[PDB]
Design an enzyme around this catalytic site. Structure first.
Site, PDB file in Angstrom:
ATOM      1  N   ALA E 159       0.868  -1.176   0.000  1.00  0.00           N
ATOM      2  CA  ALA E 159       0.000   0.000   0.000  1.00  0.00           C
ATOM      3  C   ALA E 159       0.905   1.227   0.000  1.00  0.00           C
ATOM      4  O   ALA E 159       1.420   1.617   1.051  1.00  0.00           O
ATOM      5  CB  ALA E 159      -0.940  -0.006   1.196  1.00  0.00           C
ATOM      6  N   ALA E 160       1.097   1.821  -1.174  1.00  0.00           N
ATOM      7  CA  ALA E 160       2.025   2.928  -1.368  1.00  0.00           C
ATOM      8  C   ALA E 160       1.320   4.146  -1.942  1.00  0.00           C
ATOM      9  O   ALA E 160       1.875   4.874  -2.768  1.00  0.00           O
ATOM     10  CB  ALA E 160       3.175   2.510  -2.278  1.00  0.00           C
ATOM     11  N   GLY E 164       5.486   8.040   0.461  1.00  0.00           N
ATOM     12  CA  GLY E 164       6.614   8.369   1.317  1.00  0.00           C
ATOM     13  C   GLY E 164       7.451   7.159   1.676  1.00  0.00           C
ATOM     14  O   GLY E 164       8.682   7.223   1.705  1.00  0.00           O
ATOM     15  N   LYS E 165       6.793   6.036   1.961  1.00  0.00           N
ATOM     16  CA  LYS E 165       7.512   4.848   2.406  1.00  0.00           C
ATOM     17  C   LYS E 165       8.246   4.174   1.254  1.00  0.00           C
ATOM     18  O   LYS E 165       9.394   3.743   1.407  1.00  0.00           O
ATOM     19  CB  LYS E 165       6.544   3.883   3.084  1.00  0.00           C
ATOM     20  CG  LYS E 165       6.093   4.385   4.431  1.00  0.00           C
ATOM     21  CD  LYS E 165       5.517   3.282   5.280  1.00  0.00           C
ATOM     22  CE  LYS E 165       4.352   3.806   6.086  1.00  0.00           C
ATOM     23  NZ  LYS E 165       3.611   4.865   5.347  1.00  0.00           N
ATOM     24  N   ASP E 210      -5.218  -5.629  -6.092  1.00  0.00           N
ATOM     25  CA  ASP E 210      -5.610  -5.927  -4.725  1.00  0.00           C
ATOM     26  C   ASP E 210      -4.475  -6.707  -4.075  1.00  0.00           C
ATOM     27  O   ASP E 210      -3.963  -7.671  -4.652  1.00  0.00           O
ATOM     28  CB  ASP E 210      -6.914  -6.727  -4.710  1.00  0.00           C
ATOM     29  CG  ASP E 210      -7.255  -7.299  -3.340  1.00  0.00           C
ATOM     30  OD1 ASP E 210      -6.613  -6.938  -2.332  1.00  0.00           O
ATOM     31  OD2 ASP E 210      -8.218  -8.092  -3.267  1.00  0.00           O
ATOM     32  N   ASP E 227       1.275  -1.842   5.284  1.00  0.00           N
ATOM     33  CA  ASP E 227       0.468  -0.882   6.035  1.00  0.00           C
ATOM     34  C   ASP E 227      -0.994  -1.190   5.753  1.00  0.00           C
ATOM     35  O   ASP E 227      -1.560  -0.724   4.762  1.00  0.00           O
ATOM     36  CB  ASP E 227       0.818   0.554   5.667  1.00  0.00           C
ATOM     37  CG  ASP E 227       0.941   1.445   6.885  1.00  0.00           C
ATOM     38  OD1 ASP E 227       0.065   1.358   7.773  1.00  0.00           O
ATOM     39  OD2 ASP E 227       1.906   2.230   6.958  1.00  0.00           O
ATOM     40  N   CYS E 284      -1.823   2.525  11.555  1.00  0.00           N
ATOM     41  CA  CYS E 284      -2.037   3.819  12.188  1.00  0.00           C
ATOM     42  C   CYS E 284      -3.232   3.794  13.134  1.00  0.00           C
ATOM     43  O   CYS E 284      -3.965   4.782  13.242  1.00  0.00           O
ATOM     44  CB  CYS E 284      -2.197   4.916  11.135  1.00  0.00           C
ATOM     45  SG  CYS E 284      -3.565   4.706   9.983  1.00  0.00           S
TER      46      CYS E 284
END
Lengths: 95, 96, 177, 63, 356
Positions: E159-160, E164-165, E210, E227, E284
């Site tokens: 999941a980008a 940032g990651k 997916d 994430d 998060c």
RNA sequence: GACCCUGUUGAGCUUGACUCUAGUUUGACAUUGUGAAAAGACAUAGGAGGUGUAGAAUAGGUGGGAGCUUCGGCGCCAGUG
RNA sequence: UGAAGACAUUGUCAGGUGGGGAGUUCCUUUAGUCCCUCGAAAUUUGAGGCUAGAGGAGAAAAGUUACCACA
């Protein structure tokens, strides 16, 4: 609503100046280049880069609005609510 | 690219040849300076690739991604002239 | 995703030759027996390693969106156009360079042509209409364009005279944000 | 190997150069996190004081 | 009602609970002392009952009030220097010359910078357009420090969407290797592609899949980062919709998808790797049904993975026991982060090693 | 100047069939040996263990359980859970 | 007859992709029985499966826009 806002509070450059900067490089001015949109508008973000399609429609600061007096029909009251996006203007897709 | 290769050159050449190259890089550091300063500072090392020693082209090697480590052998070189010559280069670097 | 045909490779390299010198270095073999190739995905040309290209074949073509560095797109009429996504490539082997001062960097990033008052360093013996890469005083590449006048003729030009035509600026990154 | 026919000499040098790459690689990974600014050089002065020459890949060969 | 009156009751109720043994009333139990603490926290800070009692069970009284106070106040803006282009000292100096107040974000990152204020837009500055820094969140730094990727590996970022990651892994990989950047959304993928090209990343493939299809697609990754989408109970400051739009229905579907994602990440990785077979799961959220319950599920249905030391300097140990739920004792290696303790978003990091 | 249209161009959106297969790529298995030094998981026989908050207190858990007692301490009950 | 070496190479199944070569003319939404399977939590869900409506001659190019530039 006002009281809730009161307690919570207690807890770039314009398009026109960008046009002046750009037209400085292109000294030769084509007649009718600037298209000042004389209608009221809503934009949102302070600074954005537009496609070359719309980089000629200039929207003045004085004609910008961010809030509106919105009336709730069921709960008979109206509150000043911020505008998030314009979805459809039934007069011109460009608008 | 030449600065890094020349320190490698200075490692394995006769005493006078090593001294001559050492003096040459003293002028190169003095005249240019900040263009080659990052080679002797590890924090200013580039991190956009890996150093390629045996590159076929000057630009093919990525010389700002490495650090000049040869001073740790030339400081113990048998020739006093070379040792004084090495100290001459760092004195110019420290004065940049 | 498919590799380029011989007509398309000629068009792509012709535009690149306008801006860079050693195009042999672009496709020269690397140390580990690998090389860079050109790929087309939805009329967009991509500069990417061969190893990445081979392992990107697992992704379905309707599910692939980007690959390596994007040079630009082929237009509907069959004409290659460079994009600022190709600037790191252009600056690596740039043929002619122009440096703009602080008063010219911000106008350039907004999308204005460089004028005499903005230039702080030229590249001597640069013909009239040539491809140049634009830097600021800190040697940071801002974009690329085509020169308006020769270097000798530009020296005698008025301060408010066009010296380079803009073609791509890094401010376009704010556009697709 | 395109010379003489000393495969033993060839093998002796082949294994010699391999040990040199291993040692060159050995130092490379170790020094990647060392500060060598021209003003302060404490880390490089104490790079591998607490290591003996037998532990290096060339040391294991030489013994 | 009177909001300042609610604050006084909130403070009054907390001190009573702290010293209920000596300071109490005639016959009212501490059960309805806590229940009174529920209503006035809900009415004051604008939470629904389901999430507030959930949050109150997580913390004890006086820490909980610090948590609810931290959620209303914004977080400082932090930028990440692109190691592919420069290092921190110039970017600090370059932005100082333009009128930006900077300090290092802390002693735990050699790459992050903290901004107080500026006289120019931070997202339009010339070194920003050059690809010298990206606006990121301090919590987003942590997963890639747990999953430190070396050169010449294959990595999978499931999941980008912001980017940032993924850029951080490319910087740590020095633009070597292959990074599979994946987003299930085309709209958000365009921003990731723009971020990648702006920051000068050449070793990435942006795919729109997916994340549960990846072992089928390619498989074999050395390092996989996950994430998982979550409730957002640690990003309440930026997204106030969490305070009232998270009910029991949401907290049942979300851990189910997260559990399915974690198993896909485990199967995607390569146990027999020459450099590493590490999986990092990050969230998060602060809720236990989305942290240390998904981790326990992975360890109980995949006995070929093991939790390892996360490696971040600061953080709080994960929870071993909860409301009748007994976890694997190895979960103490997982770390938690809270806004009131560290001025970073609510976050959770877990790190796995594959052995078969 | 503005308005409508056409042609070329640019920016953008959509379509561009199906079945095998070259190429490319992931996983598992087979050749295929002998030793030695380590690591993991399976076998017993042992030993030692459980501190989120509140609870006096370091509550693995599950079942009966109001009485047990080196005969004075415990229990229950009241809490807190 | 010498060299390297239990690693390569190679082979067999299962898949991903395939704008290339040969031949020929599956996912998503809607309503339903609470009908079957898979996953999750225990005192409930999500995804598939079934019934019938809607979307997706053919690598040559085609269609389209109150937008831009030129005529």
């Amino acid at each position: 609503i006002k009281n809730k806002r009161a307690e919570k509070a207690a807890r770039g450059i314009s398009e026109e100046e960008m046009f002046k900067v750009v037209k400085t490089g292109k000294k030769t001015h084509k007649k009718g280049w600037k298209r000042i949109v004389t209608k009221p508008t809503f934009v949102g973000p302070d600074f954005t880069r537009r496609p070359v399609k719309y980089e000629r429609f200039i929207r003045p600061m004085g004609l910008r609005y961010k809030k509106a007096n919105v009336t709730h029909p069921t709960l008979n009251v109206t509150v000043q609510l911020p505008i998030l996006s314009v979805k459809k203007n039934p007069s011109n897709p460009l608008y | 690219a030449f600065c890094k290769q020349l320190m490698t050159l200075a490692l394995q050449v006769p005493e006078k040849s090593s001294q001559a190259i050492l003096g040459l890089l003293q002028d190169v550091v003095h005249t240019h300076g900040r263009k080659v300063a990052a080679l002797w500072n590890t924090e200013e090392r580039k991190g956009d690739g890996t150093y390629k020693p045996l590159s076929e082209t000057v630009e093919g090697s990525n010389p700002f991604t490495t650090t000049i480590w040869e001073g740790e052998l030339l400081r113990k070189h048998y020739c006093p002239k070379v040792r004084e010559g090495l100290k001459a280069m760092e004195k110019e670097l420290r004065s940049i | 995703m498919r590799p380029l045909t011989d007509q398309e490779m000629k068009i792509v390299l012709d535009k690149l030759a306008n801006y860079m010198t050693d195009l042999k270095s672009l496709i020269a073999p690397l140390e580990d027996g690998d090389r860079y190739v050109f790929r087309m995905q939805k009329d967009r040309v991509y500069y990417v390693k061969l190893s990445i290209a081979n392992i990107a074949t697992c992704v379905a073509r309707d599910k692939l969106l980007s690959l390596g560095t994007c040079l630009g797109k082929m237009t509907k009429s069959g004409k290659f156009r460079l994009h600022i996504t190709a600037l790191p490539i252009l600056a690596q082997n740039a043929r002619y360079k122009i440096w703009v001062k602080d008063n010219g960097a911000q106008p350039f990033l907004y999308g204005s042509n460089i004028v005499k008052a903005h230039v702080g360093r030229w590249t001597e013996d640069c013909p009239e209409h040539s491809g140049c890469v634009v830097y600021n005083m800190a040697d940071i590449p801002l974009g690329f364009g085509v020169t308006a006048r020769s270097t000798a003729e530009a020296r005698r030009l008025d301060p408010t005279g066009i010296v380079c035509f803009r073609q791509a600026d890094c401010g376009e990154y704010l556009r697709d944000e | 190997r395109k010379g003489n026919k000393n495969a033993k000499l060839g093998s002796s040098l082949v294994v010699l150069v391999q040990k040199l790459e291993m040692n060159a690689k050995f130092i490379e990974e170790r020094r990647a996190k060392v500060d060598f600014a021209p003003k302060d050089r404490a880390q490089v002065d104490a790079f591998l004081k607490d290591l003996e020459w037998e532990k290096t890949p060339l040391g294991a060969y030489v013994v | 009602p009177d909001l300042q009156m609610l604050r006084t009751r909130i403070t009054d109720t907390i001190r009573v609970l702290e010293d209920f043994q000596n300071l109490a009333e005639e016959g009212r139990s501490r059960a309805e002392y806590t229940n009174q603490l529920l209503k006035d926290i809900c009415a004051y800070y604008g939470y629904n009952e389901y999430l507030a009692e959930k949050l109150l069970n997580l913390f004890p009284p006086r820490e909980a009030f610090a948590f609810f106070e931290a959620n209303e106040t914004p977080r400082p803006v932090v930028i990440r220097t692109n190691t592919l282009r420069t290092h921190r000292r110039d970017l600090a100096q370059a932005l100082i010359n333009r009128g930006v107040t900077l300090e290092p974000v802390g002693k735990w990152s050699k790459v992050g910078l903290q901004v107080f204020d500026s006289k120019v837009p931070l997202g339009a500055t010339p070194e920003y357009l050059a690809g010298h820094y990206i606006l990121q969140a301090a919590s987003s730094f942590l997963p890639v420090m747990a999953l430190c990727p070396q050169e010449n590996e294959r990595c999978l970022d499931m999941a980008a969407a912001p980017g940032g990651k993924t850029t951080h892994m490319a910087a740590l990989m020095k633009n070597t290797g292959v990074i599979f950047a994946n987003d299930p959304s085309k709209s958000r993928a365009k921003g990731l592609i723009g971020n990648i090209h702006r920051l000068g990343v050449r070793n990435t493939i942006v795919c729109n899949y997916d994340a549960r299809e990846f072992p089928r697609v390619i498989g074999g990754f050395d390092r996989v980062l996950l994430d998982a989408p979550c409730s957002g109970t640690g990003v309440i400051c930026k997204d106030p919709s969490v305070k009232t739009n998270r009910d029991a229905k949401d907290f049942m579907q979300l851990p189910h998808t997260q559990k399915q994602l974690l198993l896909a990440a485990i199967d995607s990785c390569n146990h027999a790797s020459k450099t590493g077979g590490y999986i990092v799961y990050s969230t998060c959220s602060v809720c236990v049904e989305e942290n240390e319950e998904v981790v326990n599920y992975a360890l109980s249905r995949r006995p070929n993975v093991k939790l390892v030391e996360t490696g971040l300097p600061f953080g709080k140990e994960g929870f071993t026991s909860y409301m009748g739920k007994t976890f694997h004792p190895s979960l103490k290696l997982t770390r938690r982060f809270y806004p009131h303790l560290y001025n970073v978003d609510g976050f959770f990091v877990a790190k796995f090693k594959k052995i078969g």
